[PDB]
């Protein structure tokens, strides 16, 4: 399952 | 910036048996950037409905893709893989060879 | 042995051609199990291994949701880096990310991973302590300061040490037959005469999983390592792999030559010779 926090902006 | 020429391998899923059904694979890898085009060829003309694996990449960030189709090897039909990419001066064709 | 979950993200702007495209694939070990493509008919997280299908509608919603916002936010992230590097909005650019879990054979966490590249070049990487970053340059130092100052920094790490490990262990159970039984190579040697005094011996490894394998050619006792042609391990198209190693031999002397095969699915190494028939 993906980590939502790795949608965080660069 | 990074531009990496694709490596190409053409081969079947199973050992080529004339007449028996099989899968023709064109594996391209080691390329950057990811925009690339590739068709399988039967005797020199494109194959209809060629699926491909979803875009992934290796540990040094180069991409790879597996292009495939169902096919039936004959003693006579030439199959190949035609690949183009910004690093290539013109489309590269890799002939299929059942021994490799 | 050890096991790994990885998500691979690619985000590619295509100025004048379309909106930036976002693709995610997920892997357990060498098996791909999910896929998302922001150019799809209707973008959904989609299964790609038998065992992931056990997952209820609850699951495919969260993963599709995360990937839908991934699609939105990575377009934002490409703009930041376009800004960080003072780049024209005309050129195309690529952002890539890998992240996930490693667990030992008893299922204890070993390592977390989080690395990103931009136009193919290394950009930022999570450190072993999973709570500090290494930046390739001053652009990535900007990203590093944001990521390290975030109120969420602990929950970033808590993902790699927690939820990511939990799902890996789950997946490894749902598909324990699939994912925890190495398939050994079906092996063959084949003979290909070159002239009247030289033949090519080609050692085949086929249908094996996982991809890691070693193929050595031995002339008598020692390794023909500088005369051995090796192709890259390559996907069969059915979740297994193929590879071959080849050597040119004196036409009379094929029996001096052995092929040595090591693979996780093999009790002991194999040794093959050319058996004419």
Author numbering:
A (entry chain C): 1 to 10
B (entry chain B): 0 to 99
C (entry chain A): 1 to 277
Q: How is this structure described in the published paper?
A:
Here, both neoantigen p/MHC samples show a clear unfolding transition with a highly reproducible Tm of 53.4°C for the nonamer and 59.3°C for the decamer complex, suggesting that the decamer forms a higher affinity complex with HLA-B*15:01. The nonamer complex crystallized in the P212121 space group at a resolution of 1.7 Å, while the decamer complex crystallized in the P6122 space group at a resolution of 2.6 Å. Generally, peptides of length greater than nine amino acids either bulge further out of the binding groove or form a “zig-zag” conformation. However, in our decamer complex structure, the peptide adopts a short 310 helical backbone conformation from Ile4 to Ala7, as confirmed by an inspection of φ/ψ backbone dihedral angles. Notably, while the N-terminal anchor residues are identical in the nonamer and decamer peptide, Tyr10 of the decamer replaces Tyr9 of the nonamer as the C-terminal anchor residue in a similar conformation. The accommodation of a longer peptide sequence within the fixed-size MHC groove is thus achieved through the formation of a more compact 310 helix for the decamer, relative to the extended nonamer backbone. In particular, in the decamer complex the HLA α2 helix undergoes a significant widening involving a 5.1 Å displacement of the Cα atom of Arg151. This movement is driven by a change in orientation of Arg151, which points toward the solvent in the nonamer versus toward the groove in the decamer complex, and the burying of Arg6 further toward the floor of the groove. Notably, the buried surface area (BSA) between HLA-B*15:01 and the decamer peptide is 1,986 Å2, relative to 800 Å2 in the nonamer structure. Our structural analysis suggests that an increase in the total number of intra-peptide hydrogen bonds and hydrophobic packing interactions, consistently with an increase in BSA brought on by the more compact 310 helical conformation, leads to an improved stability of the decamer complex, as confirmed independently by our DSF experiments.
In the endogenous presentation pathway (MHC class I), abundantly expressed intracellular proteins are processed by the immunoproteasome and proteasome to yield short peptide fragments that are transported into the endoplasmic reticulum and assembled together with the MHC-I heavy chain and β2-microglobulin light chain (β2m) by the peptide-loading complex. The resulting peptide/MHC complexes (p/MHC) are further trafficked through the Golgi and eventually displayed on the cell surface, where they are surveilled by CD8+ cytotoxic T cells (CTLs) through specific interactions with αβ T cell receptors (TCRs). ProTECT analysis of 106 patient samples from the NBL TARGET cohort identifies a recurring “hotspot” mutation in the ALK protein (R1275Q), together with its specificity toward common HLA alleles. Specifically, two putative peptide sequences with the R1275Q mutation, a nonamer and a decamer, are predicted to bind HLA-B*15:01 with high affinity according to consensus methods.
